[model samples]
Target: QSRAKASFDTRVAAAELALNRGVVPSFANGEELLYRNPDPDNTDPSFIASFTKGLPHDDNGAIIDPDDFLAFVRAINSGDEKEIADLTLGPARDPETGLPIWRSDLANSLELEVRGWENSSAGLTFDLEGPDAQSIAMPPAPVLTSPELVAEIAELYLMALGREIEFSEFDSPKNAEYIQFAIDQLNGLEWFNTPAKLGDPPAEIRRRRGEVTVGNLFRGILPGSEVGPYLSQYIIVGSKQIGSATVGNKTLVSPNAADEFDGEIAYGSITISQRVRIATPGRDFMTDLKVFLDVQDAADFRGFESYEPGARLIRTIRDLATWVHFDALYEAYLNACLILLANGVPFDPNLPFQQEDKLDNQDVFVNFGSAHVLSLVTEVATRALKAVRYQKFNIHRRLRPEATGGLISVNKIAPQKGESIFPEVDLAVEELGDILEKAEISNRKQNIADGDPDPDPSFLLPMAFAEGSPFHPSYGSGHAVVAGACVTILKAFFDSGIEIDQVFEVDKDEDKLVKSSFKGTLTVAGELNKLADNIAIGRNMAGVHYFSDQFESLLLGEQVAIGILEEQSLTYGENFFFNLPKFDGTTIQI
Candidate 1:
């Protein structure tokens, strides 16, 4: 009550000053710097006339002590004068629609600025008595509009509501973002996300359904994602043999004879021949040896060869992971940044890492939404191309268990140094003399779960990972590296230590009456690390990478993110921390 009375007193005094002074107490050198608005919302000095003591609003609105009020004063002043709708009062927190507070404040102030103008030196009009009008009325009373005109209309607006108006409401929007933040104060789930977006897919399906892509770069990055009914119009996979089709002056891979040398090579198998000079001069005996290209199968996988071997698993995984299996991580990476940047709680200044920078201090505003989209584009292109480059044109699953070790050679893509060291490595690059390729690089399943993979495929059955188990000497896990980079950024920006009641909804497309909730165990940082782990561990699950490849690449990925941040920070004009009061971090190496 006293606060209200005090505000009442302040407005009265300020109004009197406004009447007498060319630059009102609220504008020139009174409180904060105020803009000179030419066009205000209501052209009635009488609106402010209520501030002049003898008025209905004399004891009504505003908590005058907070800086937002002063800033609000400046906003109205500038908002009225801005030929453009921009409220250009340099740098300050918005009292109205909060963060990106500055932007909202700018817009709100423009919409709310009500200071009137009619070419008057004094803020109010003349034709006065002992009045709110400050101009000389000694001669034939000045011919100007009266403050009553302004006051009467406003009084008539909601006069019957049983109460008078408070002036501060005009300083900001009728409603703003700060209000939303307050609602989220106590697990504001009701406000944050009730049902979420309409198109959001299920958690399990959301992760993979992208042909192995985690769905990062493909969706929403450029225009939208590559939509597909099958996800395989572009990618082609079949049971093509992995080893040489040649045998002693003979060819095996067709098109070329059994005796032709094409330099082209495959991994998993080969039949080489050599000649020995016999006692019968000018005669050479030929010797041939069997190696690799083992064949094999299993009930479930063999069931797939009829419809493009590896298609079912490939499509299934692709449908979930986006072919690159980078879907979940990308979504989380973006979501983490958005939540931390858009809505903030009191942060520990000691953290040293600045997640959100004050852009109001300058003329530029960087929308994080755009940044995330661009990051998705760049990250996806680079990683996708790199994964394929090393996997196909250059680098290196297995044989099934059916035929046993007898029917197939274990080392199909072996280094045959005339049959020796330097095991096979990039199959395509294999025939390049003393080739940089090595032999015996592969992935084998441990049969950890039910219906596990066959250890050694004899004729190369359709397997998830082995002779060619998803094989490609496939060095360094892609998922790990990406997680490392993205998580580092996540950690660098947000105070992972902060606890939030992260409310999530289930049965997204379901009717509101039958929806469900999701509960998570850790703080935000904990969840961040969890997301990173989920992404990194995926490659290992597929046997596409060895444990070391997955774990070590995380470090490398982290460094990659660090580099991107450093490169981007110059324009950011400041620095900050990503507090992980959580547990372990991404373990990517290279």
Candidate 2:
């Protein structure tokens, strides 16, 4: 209650000061001067006015202590402008910039500034008044326009600009300017306004003016308006391959093979032939003799009388001769490398060596996902290729002398003359034996579980790693594709006219009919089939890849080998065979 009374007294004193001096001070200033007046007017204004008018001093002067009045006068005389201003008005100077500040109008100068508007260059400034000053008479509240209506329109403009007005709700000249700017910007946009003359404008001009609709704006920005439709058509056509063809009463166009091949066939063919004369042919040529008979039978009985009457006979002879050649060449290749190694020549020719320290000898295998399965396949394929290359080089060295002589006669006399040493075929057999043994061991080890054996693990118990376990079947067949692909690649390499030299003794004492055909076509065909089967088995075991996938990967590997052959063309004789049939449906039909 006392605080309320004190506030009431302060207001009353301020009102009296405003009445006396005709220039009202701010509330802050009035608050600071509260202690000055003791008996400030608390009754009706008329009574106070009458009572103060009869005072010996100024009307309300008697209410202030004489000592306080004297001290106030002295303080004012000694004060700086800021102190005086702060005592009289409010804190108006900005603390950071140290600049005089203006918040509202300078009440004392509003009328004077308007009268001298032409000369007044100063921006709006406020006056600092004292508590003793009277309040200025404000002009009757101006009949301003409805600020709410102006704000509503301004809000619309802000919305168009994708912004919001976030200050005083009242409208002002600044807001009016921004609103106008927004409206002008919107008007200039193509979608909002496109100028046109209805009466006499040219038709082209009219059409162009109306071309920019909201719906077509994105179309204008895109590279081609038909791109979406084109893509959709492609997808629809592609879906047919995956059994998603659209069914309709009308006939659907069947996709052409040419379209499938992307429509181009570079035309050409190169005939290739590889030949080798046999030296000391083997007497135990049972396979060769059978082939000869089959060829004779086909020609004589089957009415297949072609230019080559003994074609099968010659084929058998060639096969036996070539096997001898290949065997010799392969031995030489290995011997040359061994010789080089014996002479301290480095054996490291891009060969992958095991990092012994990092080798996982624990024989633990884990169920691999698609990616890991592919990686394992790749690793095995790479190793197989490396091993094949080693064998090929070995053959080359073993047959180098015969190859250079161009007279590959493997007669018994040649061995006696020290011109040829027919090494036992055991080496080639041993090499194959070693490869198979390694494959079996590696594959078996790869089937082990991923972690250490638990104490509960039993050797004889029917555990998960047993034959009937879920993992057993998959592990056995998981890498078969890689193995098959590797074998197929090897066969392709041999049949590719890359010869391996060897010596074969032809037993003249034996009947010619008893001699086996030397042709390796059956061997090559068998190897290829084996590879294909391996790929099918592996894919089935993996459960992710299909037969087609394995086939494609095999084809890709063949292409890689083809590239290698092309790069090494110089090493092979200029008569290297590349007589594979071109894939052409039209030719088969013809």
Candidate 3:
């Protein structure tokens, strides 16, 4: 009883100190950073090149009427029960309950109510909330006219064109033609070559601080230097068993499908399909900008959703795109945890029970064992989701990649009408001619191969899924932030320096795992960071998100996880520290 009371008093003292810190949340200039474009043709004074593609727009793809968008903003700002309830611009809900999944609801509402700040006469109090959702600072998103943005779009375009190429082929001599094509296309862009401020600098130089290369293209800035295939090892390999059955790594995906952009459908509409098949791990990778617009009837994909009883396994970007859960980000980390534990990977050196004898004498379970991490991995995901929503809905309401592609089509395909006027974009499109032509031809070829005699192809970015991006803004990606948070927790708990010897890459033209020729040592930390990158960048491969969306959001999620670790440290009785190596090239002891 005495020890319990002492512990409670200790937490109370920490809580009081936190309240005295008096940190207030802040925001960027959203008015200047985000808005709808009324007219792109003329030299209008208030023509802010922000996100306007997905909202109600004309043929030019500019938002002519923003009443629906304004309604959404107003409802979120109101924070009233009725207004939020009346909102229609969100994900699907259960048919019977009429409410979102219980976990989903909790994820959205957890940070909305900062209950610790409430003044209670009774001494019963909850732990103080971590960094205010608003307190996490993110710079304003890039304007559409900026070089950084244009370069990002170009990369997304390249990714779309390269979607059909296997990841293994990037380094192969046989794929040199495609690799050279990618390098030439990206390097040819003046904006991509010319650096712009992307918040990566020392002492605020902010001069777009990285060089463009075939190596780092569409990759995140973590694990310092590990190469070959943007997909991580953990994502490709599965545990021997998940729930009773062993599905292995090769995931079941929709048969080379794309959303329809012609014939009775609008530019960014959702299409439907009924077949799913396996992806050859080594052979089936997105190598170039080419896309398959229709499902091949002759392909191996069998049975409709009603009949196919095979359990789904997440193996590729397309697999990751289909999931919708508040805890979706934790899945990869959870799988990684099992694989690591089963392999007997050692714990972090900072752990109190790191000594062999100590661990043997004292079994770790509730505090610093499997259960503790499994719980925390999923637990941090909700907070990360909640944190990103503030940045998404409130701070930076950015549009998705699919919407941006529609605008590009309008400007590039019909320049004579002066429908969309962005001279900078026009120049970028001219340089992007090779990739664009290839994409159209590839998409058309696939359409005809799928049995459409009169297949039509346009400049709109072809997506992998029938339904494109989720109904939300693109800045501070939901998947990326959760990835950043969960992986950080894993890194903190495990020995970052311990090398993982059995490194393997998916074999090209074969559905098997092969040992990689990489000479550098693969560590627990590097692979974990790679795991995070795979999940975050996987969304980019789906043509739904931008590079900046995943890049910045990963950093944001890391901060959220750190806050939780710091708070939870106070509740533990042992005097131990978690040595967390951050994404920005530094280590912290918490």
Candidate 4:
């Protein structure tokens, strides 16, 4: 029993801490640099360096029209509320609903029309006081002419070219040569690693290298084991195996190609794969850059075809790239939670009111357990998506990797000679020629063998998806943000320090998730971090995003998730605490 005065003091102290923790800060990386130059004829190469590819342009499709690009930015940055919704680009919107008209187009609807714009106005919509959509910030994207941006695009190009190769084969004698090729190409780029290091001559390349013969690429610029293992640690342990889910009257089945094992068959259960269902390779390589621009303008979306081909076992990082990001971003984390729980991992050590000494058990339904985590994992997603949308449409307006590929190719090959655009980005001119030749050769050979008539070859980045990326800007990636937010929640709820025993991996030759022979220590925290990178970087692997899009955006989502946890802390009657590591190598407590 406590005195009334003592009770009041404790309540006020707790409330203040909770409220202060919930305060979400709003910041930006400065927009003046991008807006400084508005004239097409008199260009400012330094100012318009980052977002040059995806800006609004005129009839000539090779480069953005400076005047139109400026107008689009003005509409976003204008203090007047009236100009907020205005843009000189994309499809025409409905006069009534203010949504893109193509959303309701009869023919486009059938093909899904590359997915709708996802309601950009939602970015401006208000949420709770803390973690509002516009509260988070992302730093400026990598400049268009920088080696950092080109390195990411090169990685995507390599992902496309290496889709058919298995993860297990990466270190084989013949395939080891391919791994070295990827390493050599990536290390040749000046800013491939974090802190943005310069290319070779260190005698040690910057790309990731595993103990077994080296050459595992693109493990993300975060703390994690090298690639060619399971893309995500969660897939090996989730409770719900891959399977069908009932929606309305229909049952949506999972992807089960000849090579990919069904959940029921492989795990002796039902829900979700070593060889994920990658879209047919060589099908959409070298699509016209103008066609991509037209779609960005919302003029017309010509749906391409993805031939159905079973994927091999994931023997390399490339397979994981091709497999990840083909579903709702939260699904992987949902499986993560299920796997952790199914594996008998303990809850966070700080979970309050231990009942082990008594007959009663911890709450699992309404209060702090499975029910709570599963809901929170999905709950933060909409908020994260909206927050990143603000960074996307309102702030950065960055370009996709495919668009970057267009800019790179145009710099050297366009008829108008890219002098009107970013002529300074010629660092990759010779290297790009070599990369494109290899990419085109692989794509052409695959198409010809598959009976494709034209087998058109060009310098454009090959897309894994028929429709390419969704109708949105590339920075503050929706996938990365959601992955960041969801994984953050999982980290908070689970005991991240727990060492995982008997880790499993998909055997490349056999295409099965079998117990791995490796006996290294793997922690829950490290694997969870790796899982986030896998999902986020997987979008880059698909040739849709840049590394900047995934890297900074992951931190943005982490901020959003932390705010949510802080606010929710005050709602509970029990005194509990959660301490988890941030993506940036710091610890946060709520």
lDDT of each: 0.26, 0.22, 0.55, 0.60
Candidate 4, residues 1-590, lDDT tens digits: the string is 56687656555654564455543444433432543333566554232333333344333233354555555456554434555344444544458755444422232343322233445455676555237676556666655555656666777777777665555455567667767777777766655433424663221232222222343466665554343353556754333334533456896555542212222122324434434564564455334544445454453333354535776544444455555646577877776776766455776777664345354455555556767877788788888888888777677766677666665655545534534443544665555655667765775665555455664454667666545676567887988888888888888888887887756666656756666555677777778877888787678767777767787778788888887777677667587877777776777888
Estimate, for each residue in 210-279, the C-alpha lDDT of model 1 and write its tens digit: 1212222111110111221111101111112332234568845544222112111111134111110111
lDDT of 2 by residue, 73-139 (tens): 2333343444323321211334775332322122112211101001011101111211110121111
TM-score of 2: 0.16
- lDDT score, candidate 2: 0.22
Q: Between 1 and 2, whose TM-score is larger?
A: 1
Task: Kindly list the per-residue Cα lDDT of model 3 for residues 1-590, writing each as its tens digit.
Answer: 69889888877755654455444453543533234344556333221233332233433444444554555566545555565445333223448754332211212232121111001111111225444455565566665665556666777776666655556556667666766777777776655565545554331133242565657665666764345445555655533221222236654332322111110111112221111233322222111111111010001111111212432333333343333222257867775666555345766677666666645476666777766776787788777777677777666767567666655655675654545554535655665687777756665654554445665445666555433455456776788888888888888887767787767665666645566677667777788888787767677766767777777788878887887777777777787888888877688887
Error of 1 at 396 (Å): 11
Error of 1 at 310 (Å): 20
Which ranges in model 2 have alpha carbons more than 4 Å from their true place?
Answer: 1-380, 383-485, 495-523, 542-544, 578-590
Pick the winner on TM-score between candidates 2 and 4. Answer: 4
Candidate 3's C-alpha runs over 4 A off are: 1-55, 85-129, 190-192, 195-209, 238-327, 358-360, 416-431, 442-457
- lDDT for model 3: 0.55
Ranking by TM-score: 4, 3, 1, 2
Error of 3 at 325 (Å): 10
Worst 10 residues of 2 by lDDT: 114-123
Estimate the overall C-alpha local distance difference test score of candidate 1. Answer: 0.26
